[PDB]
Design a protein around this ligand. Structure first.
Ligand code: KSA
Ligand code: CA
Ligand code: MG
Ligand code: NA
Length: 314
């Protein structure tokens, strides 16, 4: 299912063309255009690579560690240079400098589905059908060609742009970086599968669960954990807990689910097969790739770009 499209394949080569001319990334070649978002561990800025004129997203993570340690990280990130999927943010290059490690990539003017949600309030099903295909497709490539998991699926990790592109970002690739980052830098797991919340079996199934949870929140408009009362259900459509509480409520409670009537049965059944606790029972990639929801959505002609640009102003 990793086949390529004409327009897509043409866009994949474009990046390559540019990436070639850019050359070695140097700290003094960048110019801060603005801040994009606070990503746990470091910060993301909208920079300008003066020498090339290109606009990029520079991730900065301050890690005062031994040189060999740093030179090590940069060695691991060199892997992202091989990732070529229209469902994953284009990588430009990484490097260290004066205390910080820089991760330069492709800028996504659409932002994260996290912000998009806030703007829209709640994403339409037909739209969520495009995201599913994207995320679903992304994970496959991450495993198919790159034999690695994502390990961190959430609305904030789903970047989109004015071209109607949906790509994933924030997937671990450097063990050392994670090690050094694990220091003070630490994020939540409220989007993680229960299986992992027990040091048990964890594969793409863990990502598939993450997605399922995200899709619901985007569809409903809020975090679907725990299950919102009926007062809101009839409010939002017509019709708190501690980081450790949810972490367990997620393990000792019935998985969330999309409210009936408002959504399509196929979609409802789709998420459900995603939020199946037992990673063994939960649907696998190819299983979802051929799920009625994905087939119906893959066929639907949805102008994602238009709706997005209209939902955020763009
Ligand atoms: C709260 O926001 C986040 O966690 C983001 O994923 C979302 C936010 O910053 C983060 C840290 N982020 C990241 C966290 C980790 C890797 C990449 C990003 C990231 C990228 C971009 C943007 C972005 C663009 C426009 C508005 C906000 C944006 N962000 C990113 C990127 C981008 O255009 N290209 C990569
Ligand atoms: Ca400098
Ligand atoms: Mg993260
Ligand atoms: Na600098």
């Amino acid at each position: 299912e990793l086949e390529l499209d004409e327009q897509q394949r043409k866009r994949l080569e474009a990046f390559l063309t540019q990436k070639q001319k850019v050359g070695e990334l140097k700290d003094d070649d960048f110019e801060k255009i603005s801040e994009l978002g606070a990503g746990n561990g470091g910060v993301v800025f909208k920079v300008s690579h003066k020498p090339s004129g290109l606009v990029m997203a520079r991730k900065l993570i301050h890690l005062e560690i031994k040189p060999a340690i740093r030179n090590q990280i940069i060695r691991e990130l060199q892997v992202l240079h091989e990732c070529n999927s229209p469902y994953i943010v284009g990588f430009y290059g990484a490097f260290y400098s004066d205390g910080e490690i820089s991760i330069c990539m492709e800028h996504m003017d659409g932002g994260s589905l996290d912000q998009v949600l806030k703007k829209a309030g709640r994403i339409p099903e037909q739209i969520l059908g495009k995201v599913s295909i994207a995320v679903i497709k992304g994970l496959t490539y991450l495993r198919e060609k790159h034999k690695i998991m994502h390990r961190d699926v959430k609305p904030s990790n789903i970047l989109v742009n004015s071209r109607g592109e949906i790509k994933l970002c924030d997937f671990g690739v450097s063990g050392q970086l994670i090690d050094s980052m694990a220091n003070s830098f630490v994020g939540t797991r409220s989007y993680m599968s229960p299986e992992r919340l027990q040091g048990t079996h964890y594969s793409v199934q863990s990502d598939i669960w993450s997605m399922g949870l995200s899709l619901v929140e985007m569809a409903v408009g809020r975090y679907p954990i725990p299950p919102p009362d009926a007062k809101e259900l009839e409010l939002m459509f017509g019709c708190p807990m501690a980081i450790f509480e949810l972490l367990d409520y997620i393990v000792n409670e019935p998985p969330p689910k999309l409210p009936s009537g408002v959504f399509s049965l196929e979609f409802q059944d789709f998420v459900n097969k995603c939020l199946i606790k037992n990673p063994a029972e939960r649907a696998d990639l190819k299983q979802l790739m051929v799920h009625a929801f994905i087939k119906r959505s893959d066929a639907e002609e949805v102008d994602f770009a238009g709706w997005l640009c209209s939902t955020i102003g763009l």
